[PDB]
Design a protein around this ligand. Structure first.
Ligand code: HEM
Ligand code: HEM
Ligand code: IC6
Ligand code: IC6
Lengths: 439, 444
């Protein structure tokens, strides 16, 4: 019925040069602003469709009609993440098998065992900031990445990256980041030689984490059995899961903490409510698990930060069979879709006309949010298995940050969103004035 | 660990005779004025604590520490509302099941289907007022009740009470009101019991009549979801017994608190002409068509602030009850044992000077310009958490639409210089509130 719009083309390259830019997600958002809820995007050897409305995305989230597709970004991540959970197809045997084995270690109930090690790294962050000299500022995304990397290293694998003891990030991050950089750079197109060297460095630490082998993920991956097949994970897939969780378990989370702190200092009314809750609830020197679940408004702050800037800003789907999207866009079996999460979260027909404003009170009552309107952690059985982990860590850390310091946007920072495969506010810096509450 | 104060006692009756008064909520507010943010209240076989400060109520709204309790009022309403949504305990299977089944029919998105029938009744209200003769006046709470009862009857169940064709209420209303009256009368204190059962039968008769007529005529309404909706957890639909209780619940819950809100809002507007002017200007600017649209109603921002400010000063469901899930300490100085009850005195909470400033009694809708500037749990006219009012958006959409049309089509005069007199049932209303409306002669 309806003919789909399409952005400007570049001859034989079609739409591909539109992604030859350092902020491709923000470029795709602007195109969505111009073209609406759906537009076709073409590249040599590829056709996909970018969805932006809750009306169409709720249909795309029907798992009986659409399954997770590996985007080109995920295909490049697969080169070192293998058939780990995030880069495996749903129909590959190792997805469901690893899913069954690892889901128990990610329950809201499983966070109780991780909590103490999360506090360990969180205290290290607070002490660094307590120990700054007068007029010394904080590099927010840099320190958040220190925290989330160390948290997943310790909580997941009882490995200490000791990022707060370094200026130059761990030998694993640079290789991982340069691999991730080559993955994203390849989308926008001796790099091949460096790509393999970085992959070896990652496989090097992974076999080092494994070699000597607690209350962590590595235990379940070495001892857990899939109740379906009765099998445990084989050694090859275990390595891929370790690589997967080290990546997936840190960078989207540090972005979330970075954006949350940005929005707080840009909205002092909100920071006051959040800081009062942290002070009222976190009455002990070390926060407990139960106290963290009580940080309701802090959780609302985090969800609203995820609304405006979801740090994993898209996911891909393919049609399981011939079907019609929205009653006017017919699709053939295998046709691909892209869900543009930042645009979905700005659907005025869902959230009202003031979508760009940071208002955590949108999330005061979760039942008021329509289905599939809010998708920062993906969809269905392929949703983010680490969702509860990420939110408990971020709630704990932001709560501790708000309890122990007042924050100043001393440079009046202008939001600049650096894009890798994830989003971060580049150059975000603050000053912290300690409230002198002991640990 | 502070010992909480307690109002005057009457021997073995303890505090109970203090409720033997025709304005008990306003009586309890005065006691709060004298005793402060918390006072114990005792009756034979009952002990509860009335909270009045945002400081303590924000803790009471922690759902991990406190759950909804059935007040004695709700226990008496349960005698004919059963395990419907409002009178069921959270741990009863039928609460979560009905909650899951009925939320889709109450989304901010679900109002789009209700909007046309809301306009149907709202136009009937405007036309009644257009048709008054000179020097005739309007009985505000009576007409607002005509409006809200007909709206929930039509929107909810495709049943027309036709209240604007009657001086005497529909037989269900008279029984329902007298049942609600007996429920409240039982609190402050026979053959009332014989009449109580007759009124319950009249209510069940209309309910069983609406079910019959629907089964002999698929609509877009509440009754449809109650007959066809499935709980996504269990896959079960509601059984017939609970369906009847939900109908009774929504007919009660869906009208009387809403008519109070409209009545109080119009009172505060005519007592504050600068506010009425701002609200009327927004109505004229936004409602540019003869029939208001759904989208235009969401654009009545100031009217919505007017409604929230009326709900601040006189929340028409003036209290709700909670019990401690486990042993806990309230405010760092009031220890509570598992099962201890609390009462949240909403009108007093909304007059907390530490939250709203020294001008708490003044009607200033601009207080609600920014929700982020309002401390947590300072404003609770629709309850708390998962047991909050499921009809909140329904109520606010209806009142915004109707108040918008009222301000568009008429100028209003407080011709008697009305003295606010708040009648108390289980809800609050401004008794005897009357105005004159001078039509602006804008066609529909
Ligand atoms: C704020 C933090 C996070 C965000 C916004 C986020 C976002 C997402 C999204 C959108 C997906 C779906 C990807 C797709 O459909 O292609 C996903 C999947 C996944 N995430 Fe996260 N994530 C976060 C934190 C974490 C953490 C902390 C972990 C590990 C502890 C993790 C591990 C995973 C895994 C393993 C998958 C693949 C699940 C599967 O397909 O079976 N994530 N994440
Ligand atoms: C201005 C109008 C209204 C006010 C002030 C109001 C107030 C409240 C309050 C305070 C509660 C919580 C009671 C408690 O905790 O014991 C509640 C619950 C409830 N209300 Fe309303 N309400 C209004 C309109 C409506 C409407 C229009 C409907 C139906 C369409 C409705 C249906 C309900 C139901 C079913 C519950 C029980 C929800 C549950 O516990 O699952 N209310 N209301
Ligand atoms: O939009 C994106 C960004 C998605 C990255 C999300 C990765 N993530 C998810 C969870 N943690 C990381 N990617 C498209 C771009 C493209 C379109 C057409 C042709 C070539 C490339 C793609 O990769 O296919
Ligand atoms: O204060 C109240 C007010 C009732 C709230 C209105 C109920 N509602 C909610 C939504 N629509 C109606 N009720 C107490 C009074 C009392 C205290 C101690 C002993 C006896 C009676 C109670 O019922 O327990």
């Amino acid at each position: 019925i309806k003919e789909m719009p399409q952005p400007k083309t570049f001859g034989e390259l079609k739409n591909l040069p539109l992604l030859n830019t350092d902020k491709p997600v923000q470029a795709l958002m602007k195109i969505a602003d111009e073209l609406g809820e759906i537009f076709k995007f073409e590249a040599p050897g590829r056709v996909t469709r970018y969805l932006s409305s809750q009306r169409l995305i709720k249909e795309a989230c029907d798992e009986s009609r659409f399954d997770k597709n590996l985007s080109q970004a995920l295909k490049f991540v697969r080169d070192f993440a293998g058939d780990g959970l995030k880069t495996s197809w749903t129909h590959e045997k190792n997805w469901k098998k690893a899913h069954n084995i690892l889901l128990p270690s990610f329950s809201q109930q499983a966070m109780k065992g991780y909590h103490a090690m999360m506090v360990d790294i969180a205290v290290q962050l607070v002490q660094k900031w307590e120990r700054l000299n007068a007029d010394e500022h904080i590099e927010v995304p840099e320190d958040m990445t220190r925290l989330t990397l160390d948290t997943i290293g310790l909580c997941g694998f009882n490995y200490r990256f000791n990022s707060f003891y370094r200026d130059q990030p761990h030998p694993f991050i640079t290789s991982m980041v340069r691999a991730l950089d080559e993955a994203m750079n390849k989308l926008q197109r001796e790099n091949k030689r460096q790509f393999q060297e970085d992959i070896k460095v990652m496989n090097d630490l992974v076999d080092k984490i494994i070699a000597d082998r607690s209350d962590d993920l590595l235990t379940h991956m070495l001892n857990g059995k899939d109740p379906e097949t009765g099998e445990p994970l084989d050694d090859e897939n275990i390595r891929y899961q370790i690589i997967t969780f080290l990546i997936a378990g840190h960078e989207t989370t540090s972005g979330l903490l970075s954006f949350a702190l940005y929005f707080l200092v840009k909205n002092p009314h909100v920071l006051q409510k959040a800081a009062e809750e942290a002070a009222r609830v976190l009455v002990d020197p070390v926060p407990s698990y139960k106290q963290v679940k009580q940080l309701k408004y802090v959780g609302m702050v985090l969800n609203e930060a995820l609304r405006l800037w979801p740090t994993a800003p898209a996911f891909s789907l393919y049609a399981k069979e011939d079907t019609v999207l929205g009653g006017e866009y017919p699709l053939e079996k295998g046709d691909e879709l892209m869900v543009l999460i930042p645009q979905l979260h700005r659907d005025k027909t869902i959230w009202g006309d003031d979508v760009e404003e940071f208002r955590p009170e949108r999330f005061e009552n979760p039942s008021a949010i329509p289905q599939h309107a809010f998708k920062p952690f993906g969809n269905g059985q392929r949703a983010c298995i680490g969702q509860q982990f990420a939110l408990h860590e971020a709630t704990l850390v932001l709560g501790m940050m708000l309890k122990h310091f007042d924050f100043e946007d001393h440079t009046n920072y202008e939001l600049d969103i650096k894009e890798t495969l994830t989003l971060k506010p580049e150059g975000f810096v603050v000053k912290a004035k300690s409230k002198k509450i002991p640990l």
